[PDB]
Amino acid sequence: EFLPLDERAFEKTLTPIIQEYFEHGDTNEVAEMLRDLNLGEMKSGVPVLAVSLALEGKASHREMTSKLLSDLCGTVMSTTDVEKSFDKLLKDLPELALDTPRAPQLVGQFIARAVGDGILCNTYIDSYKDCVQARAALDKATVLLSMSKVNHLVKEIDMLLKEYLLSGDISEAEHCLKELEVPHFHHELVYEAIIMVLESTGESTFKMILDLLKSLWKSSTITVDQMKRGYERIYNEIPDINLDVPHSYSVLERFVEECFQAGIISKQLRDLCPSR
């Protein structure tokens, strides 16, 4: 452990290096600067500082931090340093949550992405042993990783939806949805969401998808246009989907009717659904 004096000199020196990186994005520049600082056993403090700085910053700063961790590991910092970082990050989680209410989830994202970059191991989560917040972070990591087993936007929607089907958390799906900031492309969520409902087996996904759409409509998240666009896309492709996914029309017209009866689509949208 270190004295609060040396912890302050560390923060003071490193904050403008990290805060600047967020601005120039040059990972190599940071690498060189950290080399000249000749950090001893306080190397593991770099990912701790960078993550907590990122948490308090723009959404883009979190991705940038992940890249930084991946790049710095195996050059100026070992995997042991990185592991020690995430250990403390999970300990300081309740105090990080004070400044960033969603810290658990975002630390989950940091972990999963660290495992994906190979700077954390895939056995790190399972080998961790109080504190609900800490468990929240690990649970987010697991879900993100296991689900992870071009259309970048659709890929984000796919994962958003898959996560929602696993947890059933409307709020998490809605929040994470906005985070994407794509108001004129929510028709992509609707379309993709419906596809899952037709491809599903059992009345489980159907009911889930329906719930989500109802919630997202009432909270003014998915405007009429986006919502209408999504349905029109399905109605356009259903003669084809029918050919590959047995009884697609029957599922679709049950779904469209449920949505109309719940009052989330107009009579026009309902009526425009092909009967065949």
Side-chain angles (χ1 to χ4, degrees):
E1 69 172 18
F2 304 90
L3 289 323
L5 167 70
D6 285 13
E7 205 159 30
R8 177 56 198 150
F10 180 81
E11 289 193 69
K12 202 205 201 310
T13 309
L14 269 87
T15 297
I17 273 86
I18 295 167
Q19 232 143 40
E20 265 158 55
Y21 161 67
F22 290 147
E23 224 55 48
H24 65 241
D26 190 326
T27 260
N28 191 248
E29 197 190 319
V30 180
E32 292 175 13
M33 274 186 273
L34 298 186
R35 203 171 306 187
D36 292 335
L37 291 178
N38 193 40
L39 313 161
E41 285 164 323
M42 68 197 316
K43 274 182 285 183
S44 80
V46 185
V48 179
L49 183 61
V51 162
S52 57
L53 254 28
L55 290 163
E56 289 171 324
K58 309 169 70 173
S60 69
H61 294 348
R62 317 193 213 106
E63 174 62 24
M64 291 180 80
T65 296
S66 277
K67 297 184 196 187
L68 184 67
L69 304 185
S70 175
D71 288 5
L72 294 176
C73 186
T75 308
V76 306
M77 186 179 43
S78 65
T79 44
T80 305
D81 295 318
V82 179
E83 190 186 316
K84 285 175 181 169
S85 300
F86 280 97
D87 277 358
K88 208 210 177 196
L89 231 43
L90 289 166
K91 270 176 187 170
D92 296 349
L93 212 269
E95 100 157 71
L96 284 169
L98 289 176
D99 293 321
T100 309
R102 282 187 55 77
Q105 288 75 212
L106 300 177
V107 166
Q109 279 157 45
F110 274 117
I111 293 167
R113 167 63 179 277
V115 171
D117 292 344
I119 68 173
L120 266 181
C121 248
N122 211 11
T123 65
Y124 177 81
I125 295 97
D126 288 352
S127 54
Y128 205 88
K129 287 177 182 182
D130 57 58
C131 175
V132 293
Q133 290 189 297
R135 199 160 55 248
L138 293 166
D139 288 347
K140 189 81 167 74
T142 310
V143 174
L144 283 164
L145 282 168
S146 85
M147 163 193 72
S148 167
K149 280 176 181 177
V150 184
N151 209 140
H152 300 274
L153 177 46
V154 171
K155 192 197 178 184
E156 296 296 332
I157 297 303
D158 183 59
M159 292 188 298
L160 188 159
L161 287 171
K162 285 181 177 169
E163 184 171 348
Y164 166 76
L165 291 177
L166 286 160
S167 81
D169 195 351
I170 278 97
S171 195
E172 182 67 15
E174 171 181 285
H175 162 85
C176 134
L177 179 56
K178 312 187 171 178
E179 284 276 37
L180 296 166
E181 304 192 54
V182 284
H184 307 283
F185 295 96
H186 289 162
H187 71 88
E188 210 70 68
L189 186 292
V190 181
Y191 172 88
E192 228 53 72
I194 290 175
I195 298 165
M196 280 183 185
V197 168
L198 312 166
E199 272 184 337
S200 74
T201 335
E203 278 290 304
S204 186
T205 286
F206 174 119
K207 165 78 175 178
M208 289 207 274
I209 288 173
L210 192 36
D211 276 341
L212 181 64
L213 294 184
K214 282 167 60 172
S215 178
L216 286 174
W217 167 256
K218 304 184 208 291
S219 73
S220 296
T221 306
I222 296 174
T223 43
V224 219
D225 190 359
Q226 280 329 291
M227 175 89 153
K228 156 152 99 168
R229 177 75 220 266
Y231 283 75
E232 260 149 350
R233 279 173 67 195
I234 265 84
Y235 302 160
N236 221 72
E237 286 174 13
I238 194 75
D240 286 356
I241 303 166
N242 208 44
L243 302 188
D244 296 328
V245 196
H247 312 288
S248 283
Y249 275 101
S250 67
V251 172
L252 201 257
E253 70 187 41
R254 284 196 302 116
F255 195 83
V256 161
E257 193 61 23
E258 287 285 291
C259 286
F260 177 65
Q261 226 74 233
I264 71 166
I265 56 166
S266 59
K267 184 175 65 176
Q268 195 177 42
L269 255 181
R270 197 276 293 257
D271 288 345
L272 200 62
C273 177
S275 82
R276 86 88 82 264

PDB file of all heavy atoms in Angstrom, residues 176-205:
ATOM      1  N   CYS A 176     -29.792   1.619 -22.137  1.00  0.00           N
ATOM      2  CA  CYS A 176     -28.719   1.247 -23.047  1.00  0.00           C
ATOM      3  C   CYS A 176     -29.075   1.586 -24.493  1.00  0.00           C
ATOM      4  O   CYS A 176     -28.199   1.875 -25.312  1.00  0.00           O
ATOM      5  CB  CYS A 176     -28.405  -0.240 -22.899  1.00  0.00           C
ATOM      6  SG  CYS A 176     -28.247  -1.102 -24.470  1.00  0.00           S
ATOM      7  N   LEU A 177     -30.369   1.570 -24.793  1.00  0.00           N
ATOM      8  CA  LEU A 177     -30.850   1.926 -26.121  1.00  0.00           C
ATOM      9  C   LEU A 177     -30.545   3.384 -26.444  1.00  0.00           C
ATOM     10  O   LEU A 177     -29.978   3.693 -27.489  1.00  0.00           O
ATOM     11  CB  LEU A 177     -32.352   1.663 -26.244  1.00  0.00           C
ATOM     12  CG  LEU A 177     -32.955   2.040 -27.603  1.00  0.00           C
ATOM     13  CD1 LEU A 177     -32.230   1.321 -28.732  1.00  0.00           C
ATOM     14  CD2 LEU A 177     -34.452   1.770 -27.657  1.00  0.00           C
ATOM     15  N   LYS A 178     -30.922   4.280 -25.539  1.00  0.00           N
ATOM     16  CA  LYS A 178     -30.681   5.707 -25.725  1.00  0.00           C
ATOM     17  C   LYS A 178     -29.189   6.007 -25.818  1.00  0.00           C
ATOM     18  O   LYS A 178     -28.753   6.807 -26.648  1.00  0.00           O
ATOM     19  CB  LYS A 178     -31.311   6.498 -24.583  1.00  0.00           C
ATOM     20  CG  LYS A 178     -32.745   6.098 -24.301  1.00  0.00           C
ATOM     21  CD  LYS A 178     -33.380   7.020 -23.276  1.00  0.00           C
ATOM     22  CE  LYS A 178     -34.872   6.761 -23.158  1.00  0.00           C
ATOM     23  NZ  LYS A 178     -35.514   7.624 -22.128  1.00  0.00           N
ATOM     24  N   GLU A 179     -28.408   5.346 -24.970  1.00  0.00           N
ATOM     25  CA  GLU A 179     -26.962   5.510 -24.980  1.00  0.00           C
ATOM     26  C   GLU A 179     -26.410   5.444 -26.399  1.00  0.00           C
ATOM     27  O   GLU A 179     -25.381   6.050 -26.698  1.00  0.00           O
ATOM     28  CB  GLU A 179     -26.285   4.449 -24.104  1.00  0.00           C
ATOM     29  CG  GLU A 179     -26.385   4.701 -22.598  1.00  0.00           C
ATOM     30  CD  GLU A 179     -25.310   5.645 -22.053  1.00  0.00           C
ATOM     31  OE1 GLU A 179     -24.926   6.618 -22.744  1.00  0.00           O
ATOM     32  OE2 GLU A 179     -24.848   5.414 -20.913  1.00  0.00           O
ATOM     33  N   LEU A 180     -27.094   4.706 -27.268  1.00  0.00           N
ATOM     34  CA  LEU A 180     -26.645   4.556 -28.651  1.00  0.00           C
ATOM     35  C   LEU A 180     -26.905   5.829 -29.449  1.00  0.00           C
ATOM     36  O   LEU A 180     -26.266   6.069 -30.473  1.00  0.00           O
ATOM     37  CB  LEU A 180     -27.322   3.357 -29.324  1.00  0.00           C
ATOM     38  CG  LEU A 180     -27.039   1.962 -28.758  1.00  0.00           C
ATOM     39  CD1 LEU A 180     -28.042   0.960 -29.304  1.00  0.00           C
ATOM     40  CD2 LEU A 180     -25.610   1.514 -29.052  1.00  0.00           C
ATOM     41  N   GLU A 181     -27.843   6.638 -28.961  1.00  0.00           N
ATOM     42  CA  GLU A 181     -28.221   7.899 -29.605  1.00  0.00           C
ATOM     43  C   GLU A 181     -28.453   7.756 -31.112  1.00  0.00           C
ATOM     44  O   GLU A 181     -27.704   8.304 -31.924  1.00  0.00           O
ATOM     45  CB  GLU A 181     -27.188   8.996 -29.318  1.00  0.00           C
ATOM     46  CG  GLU A 181     -26.933   9.239 -27.839  1.00  0.00           C
ATOM     47  CD  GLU A 181     -26.146  10.512 -27.574  1.00  0.00           C
ATOM     48  OE1 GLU A 181     -26.568  11.587 -28.052  1.00  0.00           O
ATOM     49  OE2 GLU A 181     -25.101  10.437 -26.891  1.00  0.00           O
ATOM     50  N   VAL A 182     -29.499   7.021 -31.477  1.00  0.00           N
ATOM     51  CA  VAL A 182     -29.851   6.804 -32.881  1.00  0.00           C
ATOM     52  C   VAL A 182     -31.363   6.901 -33.092  1.00  0.00           C
ATOM     53  O   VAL A 182     -31.968   6.002 -33.674  1.00  0.00           O
ATOM     54  CB  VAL A 182     -29.352   5.431 -33.400  1.00  0.00           C
ATOM     55  CG1 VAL A 182     -27.853   5.460 -33.658  1.00  0.00           C
ATOM     56  CG2 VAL A 182     -29.718   4.313 -32.427  1.00  0.00           C
ATOM     57  N   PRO A 183     -31.974   8.006 -32.632  1.00  0.00           N
ATOM     58  CA  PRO A 183     -33.430   8.172 -32.644  1.00  0.00           C
ATOM     59  C   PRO A 183     -34.115   7.857 -33.978  1.00  0.00           C
ATOM     60  O   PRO A 183     -35.248   7.377 -33.983  1.00  0.00           O
ATOM     61  CB  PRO A 183     -33.623   9.653 -32.279  1.00  0.00           C
ATOM     62  CG  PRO A 183     -32.268  10.289 -32.435  1.00  0.00           C
ATOM     63  CD  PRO A 183     -31.299   9.207 -32.113  1.00  0.00           C
ATOM     64  N   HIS A 184     -33.443   8.125 -35.095  1.00  0.00           N
ATOM     65  CA  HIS A 184     -34.045   7.901 -36.408  1.00  0.00           C
ATOM     66  C   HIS A 184     -33.726   6.518 -36.961  1.00  0.00           C
ATOM     67  O   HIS A 184     -33.940   6.249 -38.142  1.00  0.00           O
ATOM     68  CB  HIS A 184     -33.607   8.985 -37.393  1.00  0.00           C
ATOM     69  CG  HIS A 184     -33.844  10.376 -36.897  1.00  0.00           C
ATOM     70  ND1 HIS A 184     -35.093  10.960 -36.886  1.00  0.00           N
ATOM     71  CD2 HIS A 184     -32.994  11.298 -36.387  1.00  0.00           C
ATOM     72  CE1 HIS A 184     -35.001  12.182 -36.393  1.00  0.00           C
ATOM     73  NE2 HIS A 184     -33.738  12.412 -36.083  1.00  0.00           N
ATOM     74  N   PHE A 185     -33.229   5.639 -36.097  1.00  0.00           N
ATOM     75  CA  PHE A 185     -32.896   4.281 -36.501  1.00  0.00           C
ATOM     76  C   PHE A 185     -33.396   3.257 -35.492  1.00  0.00           C
ATOM     77  O   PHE A 185     -32.934   2.117 -35.458  1.00  0.00           O
ATOM     78  CB  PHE A 185     -31.393   4.157 -36.746  1.00  0.00           C
ATOM     79  CG  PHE A 185     -30.920   4.982 -37.901  1.00  0.00           C
ATOM     80  CD1 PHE A 185     -30.381   6.241 -37.702  1.00  0.00           C
ATOM     81  CD2 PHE A 185     -31.058   4.514 -39.196  1.00  0.00           C
ATOM     82  CE1 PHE A 185     -29.966   7.007 -38.773  1.00  0.00           C
ATOM     83  CE2 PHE A 185     -30.644   5.274 -40.270  1.00  0.00           C
ATOM     84  CZ  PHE A 185     -30.095   6.521 -40.059  1.00  0.00           C
ATOM     85  N   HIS A 186     -34.360   3.674 -34.677  1.00  0.00           N
ATOM     86  CA  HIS A 186     -35.001   2.771 -33.737  1.00  0.00           C
ATOM     87  C   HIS A 186     -35.843   1.731 -34.471  1.00  0.00           C
ATOM     88  O   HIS A 186     -36.195   0.695 -33.904  1.00  0.00           O
ATOM     89  CB  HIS A 186     -35.859   3.549 -32.736  1.00  0.00           C
ATOM     90  CG  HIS A 186     -35.065   4.338 -31.741  1.00  0.00           C
ATOM     91  ND1 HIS A 186     -35.608   5.368 -31.003  1.00  0.00           N
ATOM     92  CD2 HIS A 186     -33.763   4.257 -31.373  1.00  0.00           C
ATOM     93  CE1 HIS A 186     -34.679   5.879 -30.214  1.00  0.00           C
ATOM     94  NE2 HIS A 186     -33.549   5.226 -30.422  1.00  0.00           N
ATOM     95  N   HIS A 187     -36.161   2.009 -35.733  1.00  0.00           N
ATOM     96  CA  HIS A 187     -36.867   1.044 -36.574  1.00  0.00           C
ATOM     97  C   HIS A 187     -36.040  -0.236 -36.699  1.00  0.00           C
ATOM     98  O   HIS A 187     -36.568  -1.311 -36.997  1.00  0.00           O
ATOM     99  CB  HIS A 187     -37.179   1.635 -37.956  1.00  0.00           C
ATOM    100  CG  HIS A 187     -35.982   1.806 -38.841  1.00  0.00           C
ATOM    101  ND1 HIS A 187     -35.516   0.804 -39.666  1.00  0.00           N
ATOM    102  CD2 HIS A 187     -35.174   2.872 -39.052  1.00  0.00           C
ATOM    103  CE1 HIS A 187     -34.466   1.242 -40.338  1.00  0.00           C
ATOM    104  NE2 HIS A 187     -34.237   2.493 -39.982  1.00  0.00           N
ATOM    105  N   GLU A 188     -34.742  -0.101 -36.451  1.00  0.00           N
ATOM    106  CA  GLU A 188     -33.810  -1.219 -36.483  1.00  0.00           C
ATOM    107  C   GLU A 188     -34.021  -2.153 -35.283  1.00  0.00           C
ATOM    108  O   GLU A 188     -33.926  -3.374 -35.407  1.00  0.00           O
ATOM    109  CB  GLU A 188     -32.376  -0.685 -36.505  1.00  0.00           C
ATOM    110  CG  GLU A 188     -31.402  -1.577 -37.224  1.00  0.00           C
ATOM    111  CD  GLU A 188     -31.637  -1.603 -38.718  1.00  0.00           C
ATOM    112  OE1 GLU A 188     -31.402  -0.567 -39.377  1.00  0.00           O
ATOM    113  OE2 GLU A 188     -32.039  -2.669 -39.237  1.00  0.00           O
ATOM    114  N   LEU A 189     -34.301  -1.566 -34.123  1.00  0.00           N
ATOM    115  CA  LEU A 189     -34.635  -2.319 -32.913  1.00  0.00           C
ATOM    116  C   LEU A 189     -35.952  -3.080 -33.108  1.00  0.00           C
ATOM    117  O   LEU A 189     -36.049  -4.283 -32.838  1.00  0.00           O
ATOM    118  CB  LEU A 189     -34.747  -1.347 -31.727  1.00  0.00           C
ATOM    119  CG  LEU A 189     -34.964  -1.783 -30.267  1.00  0.00           C
ATOM    120  CD1 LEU A 189     -36.346  -2.388 -30.034  1.00  0.00           C
ATOM    121  CD2 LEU A 189     -33.869  -2.724 -29.773  1.00  0.00           C
ATOM    122  N   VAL A 190     -36.962  -2.359 -33.584  1.00  0.00           N
ATOM    123  CA  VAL A 190     -38.270  -2.934 -33.843  1.00  0.00           C
ATOM    124  C   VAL A 190     -38.162  -4.111 -34.808  1.00  0.00           C
ATOM    125  O   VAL A 190     -38.652  -5.207 -34.526  1.00  0.00           O
ATOM    126  CB  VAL A 190     -39.218  -1.878 -34.436  1.00  0.00           C
ATOM    127  CG1 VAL A 190     -40.588  -2.472 -34.690  1.00  0.00           C
ATOM    128  CG2 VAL A 190     -39.312  -0.674 -33.506  1.00  0.00           C
ATOM    129  N   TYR A 191     -37.521  -3.881 -35.949  1.00  0.00           N
ATOM    130  CA  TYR A 191     -37.350  -4.927 -36.948  1.00  0.00           C
ATOM    131  C   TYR A 191     -36.640  -6.139 -36.360  1.00  0.00           C
ATOM    132  O   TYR A 191     -37.130  -7.269 -36.440  1.00  0.00           O
ATOM    133  CB  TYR A 191     -36.560  -4.397 -38.144  1.00  0.00           C
ATOM    134  CG  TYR A 191     -36.169  -5.468 -39.137  1.00  0.00           C
ATOM    135  CD1 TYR A 191     -37.020  -5.823 -40.175  1.00  0.00           C
ATOM    136  CD2 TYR A 191     -34.951  -6.130 -39.033  1.00  0.00           C
ATOM    137  CE1 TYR A 191     -36.665  -6.798 -41.083  1.00  0.00           C
ATOM    138  CE2 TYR A 191     -34.591  -7.106 -39.932  1.00  0.00           C
ATOM    139  CZ  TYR A 191     -35.448  -7.436 -40.956  1.00  0.00           C
ATOM    140  OH  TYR A 191     -35.090  -8.410 -41.858  1.00  0.00           O
ATOM    141  N   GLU A 192     -35.473  -5.893 -35.776  1.00  0.00           N
ATOM    142  CA  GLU A 192     -34.661  -6.962 -35.226  1.00  0.00           C
ATOM    143  C   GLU A 192     -35.423  -7.668 -34.105  1.00  0.00           C
ATOM    144  O   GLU A 192     -35.416  -8.898 -34.016  1.00  0.00           O
ATOM    145  CB  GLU A 192     -33.330  -6.405 -34.722  1.00  0.00           C
ATOM    146  CG  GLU A 192     -32.137  -7.204 -35.200  1.00  0.00           C
ATOM    147  CD  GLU A 192     -32.130  -7.377 -36.709  1.00  0.00           C
ATOM    148  OE1 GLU A 192     -31.869  -6.383 -37.424  1.00  0.00           O
ATOM    149  OE2 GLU A 192     -32.377  -8.508 -37.184  1.00  0.00           O
ATOM    150  N   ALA A 193     -36.094  -6.883 -33.266  1.00  0.00           N
ATOM    151  CA  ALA A 193     -36.879  -7.435 -32.168  1.00  0.00           C
ATOM    152  C   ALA A 193     -37.944  -8.406 -32.684  1.00  0.00           C
ATOM    153  O   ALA A 193     -38.097  -9.512 -32.164  1.00  0.00           O
ATOM    154  CB  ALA A 193     -37.518  -6.318 -31.355  1.00  0.00           C
ATOM    155  N   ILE A 194     -38.670  -7.992 -33.716  1.00  0.00           N
ATOM    156  CA  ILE A 194     -39.733  -8.817 -34.281  1.00  0.00           C
ATOM    157  C   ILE A 194     -39.179 -10.093 -34.914  1.00  0.00           C
ATOM    158  O   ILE A 194     -39.749 -11.173 -34.760  1.00  0.00           O
ATOM    159  CB  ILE A 194     -40.556  -8.038 -35.316  1.00  0.00           C
ATOM    160  CG1 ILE A 194     -41.386  -6.956 -34.619  1.00  0.00           C
ATOM    161  CG2 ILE A 194     -41.458  -8.975 -36.104  1.00  0.00           C
ATOM    162  CD1 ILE A 194     -42.127  -6.058 -35.576  1.00  0.00           C
ATOM    163  N   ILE A 195     -38.061  -9.967 -35.618  1.00  0.00           N
ATOM    164  CA  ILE A 195     -37.402 -11.128 -36.213  1.00  0.00           C
ATOM    165  C   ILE A 195     -37.133 -12.209 -35.164  1.00  0.00           C
ATOM    166  O   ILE A 195     -37.335 -13.405 -35.410  1.00  0.00           O
ATOM    167  CB  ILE A 195     -36.071 -10.732 -36.881  1.00  0.00           C
ATOM    168  CG1 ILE A 195     -36.318  -9.749 -38.027  1.00  0.00           C
ATOM    169  CG2 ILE A 195     -35.343 -11.961 -37.400  1.00  0.00           C
ATOM    170  CD1 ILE A 195     -35.056  -9.048 -38.496  1.00  0.00           C
ATOM    171  N   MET A 196     -36.669 -11.782 -33.992  1.00  0.00           N
ATOM    172  CA  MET A 196     -36.398 -12.711 -32.894  1.00  0.00           C
ATOM    173  C   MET A 196     -37.677 -13.411 -32.454  1.00  0.00           C
ATOM    174  O   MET A 196     -37.684 -14.615 -32.182  1.00  0.00           O
ATOM    175  CB  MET A 196     -35.761 -11.987 -31.703  1.00  0.00           C
ATOM    176  CG  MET A 196     -34.266 -11.731 -31.843  1.00  0.00           C
ATOM    177  SD  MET A 196     -33.548 -10.964 -30.381  1.00  0.00           S
ATOM    178  CE  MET A 196     -31.873 -10.692 -30.960  1.00  0.00           C
ATOM    179  N   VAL A 197     -38.761 -12.647 -32.381  1.00  0.00           N
ATOM    180  CA  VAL A 197     -40.052 -13.201 -32.007  1.00  0.00           C
ATOM    181  C   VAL A 197     -40.554 -14.277 -32.977  1.00  0.00           C
ATOM    182  O   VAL A 197     -41.160 -15.256 -32.549  1.00  0.00           O
ATOM    183  CB  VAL A 197     -41.126 -12.117 -31.880  1.00  0.00           C
ATOM    184  CG1 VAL A 197     -42.490 -12.776 -31.784  1.00  0.00           C
ATOM    185  CG2 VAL A 197     -40.845 -11.201 -30.672  1.00  0.00           C
ATOM    186  N   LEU A 198     -40.309 -14.100 -34.277  1.00  0.00           N
ATOM    187  CA  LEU A 198     -40.732 -15.089 -35.270  1.00  0.00           C
ATOM    188  C   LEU A 198     -39.805 -16.292 -35.328  1.00  0.00           C
ATOM    189  O   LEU A 198     -40.211 -17.379 -35.742  1.00  0.00           O
ATOM    190  CB  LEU A 198     -40.787 -14.476 -36.667  1.00  0.00           C
ATOM    191  CG  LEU A 198     -41.492 -13.142 -36.908  1.00  0.00           C
ATOM    192  CD1 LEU A 198     -41.093 -12.604 -38.272  1.00  0.00           C
ATOM    193  CD2 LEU A 198     -43.011 -13.236 -36.806  1.00  0.00           C
ATOM    194  N   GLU A 199     -38.555 -16.080 -34.937  1.00  0.00           N
ATOM    195  CA  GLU A 199     -37.526 -17.106 -35.014  1.00  0.00           C
ATOM    196  C   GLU A 199     -37.508 -17.921 -33.732  1.00  0.00           C
ATOM    197  O   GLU A 199     -36.846 -18.952 -33.640  1.00  0.00           O
ATOM    198  CB  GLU A 199     -36.160 -16.454 -35.226  1.00  0.00           C
ATOM    199  CG  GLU A 199     -35.797 -16.205 -36.673  1.00  0.00           C
ATOM    200  CD  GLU A 199     -34.402 -15.646 -36.808  1.00  0.00           C
ATOM    201  OE1 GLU A 199     -33.907 -15.067 -35.815  1.00  0.00           O
ATOM    202  OE2 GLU A 199     -33.798 -15.786 -37.894  1.00  0.00           O
ATOM    203  N   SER A 200     -38.242 -17.435 -32.742  1.00  0.00           N
ATOM    204  CA  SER A 200     -38.219 -18.019 -31.410  1.00  0.00           C
ATOM    205  C   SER A 200     -38.982 -19.336 -31.387  1.00  0.00           C
ATOM    206  O   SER A 200     -39.729 -19.646 -32.310  1.00  0.00           O
ATOM    207  CB  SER A 200     -38.837 -17.047 -30.407  1.00  0.00           C
ATOM    208  OG  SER A 200     -40.242 -17.009 -30.559  1.00  0.00           O
ATOM    209  N   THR A 201     -38.775 -20.118 -30.333  1.00  0.00           N
ATOM    210  CA  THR A 201     -39.557 -21.327 -30.113  1.00  0.00           C
ATOM    211  C   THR A 201     -40.213 -21.236 -28.735  1.00  0.00           C
ATOM    212  O   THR A 201     -39.532 -21.062 -27.725  1.00  0.00           O
ATOM    213  CB  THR A 201     -38.680 -22.592 -30.176  1.00  0.00           C
ATOM    214  OG1 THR A 201     -37.526 -22.335 -30.983  1.00  0.00           O
ATOM    215  CG2 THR A 201     -39.465 -23.772 -30.760  1.00  0.00           C
ATOM    216  N   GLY A 202     -41.535 -21.352 -28.703  1.00  0.00           N
ATOM    217  CA  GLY A 202     -42.282 -21.168 -27.462  1.00  0.00           C
ATOM    218  C   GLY A 202     -42.841 -19.761 -27.343  1.00  0.00           C
ATOM    219  O   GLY A 202     -42.386 -18.843 -28.028  1.00  0.00           O
ATOM    220  N   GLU A 203     -43.826 -19.588 -26.469  1.00  0.00           N
ATOM    221  CA  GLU A 203     -44.493 -18.297 -26.308  1.00  0.00           C
ATOM    222  C   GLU A 203     -43.741 -17.375 -25.349  1.00  0.00           C
ATOM    223  O   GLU A 203     -44.293 -16.383 -24.873  1.00  0.00           O
ATOM    224  CB  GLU A 203     -45.939 -18.488 -25.833  1.00  0.00           C
ATOM    225  CG  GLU A 203     -46.933 -18.818 -26.952  1.00  0.00           C
ATOM    226  CD  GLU A 203     -47.187 -17.637 -27.882  1.00  0.00           C
ATOM    227  OE1 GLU A 203     -47.580 -16.558 -27.383  1.00  0.00           O
ATOM    228  OE2 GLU A 203     -47.007 -17.788 -29.113  1.00  0.00           O
ATOM    229  N   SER A 204     -42.478 -17.697 -25.081  1.00  0.00           N
ATOM    230  CA  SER A 204     -41.683 -16.949 -24.114  1.00  0.00           C
ATOM    231  C   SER A 204     -41.144 -15.642 -24.696  1.00  0.00           C
ATOM    232  O   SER A 204     -41.430 -14.556 -24.188  1.00  0.00           O
ATOM    233  CB  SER A 204     -40.527 -17.813 -23.598  1.00  0.00           C
ATOM    234  OG  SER A 204     -39.809 -17.159 -22.563  1.00  0.00           O
ATOM    235  N   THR A 205     -40.357 -15.754 -25.758  1.00  0.00           N
ATOM    236  CA  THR A 205     -39.790 -14.581 -26.410  1.00  0.00           C
ATOM    237  C   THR A 205     -40.890 -13.633 -26.885  1.00  0.00           C
ATOM    238  O   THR A 205     -40.793 -12.422 -26.710  1.00  0.00           O
ATOM    239  CB  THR A 205     -38.894 -14.980 -27.596  1.00  0.00           C
ATOM    240  OG1 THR A 205     -37.661 -15.516 -27.104  1.00  0.00           O
ATOM    241  CG2 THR A 205     -38.594 -13.784 -28.469  1.00  0.00           C
TER     242      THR A 205
END
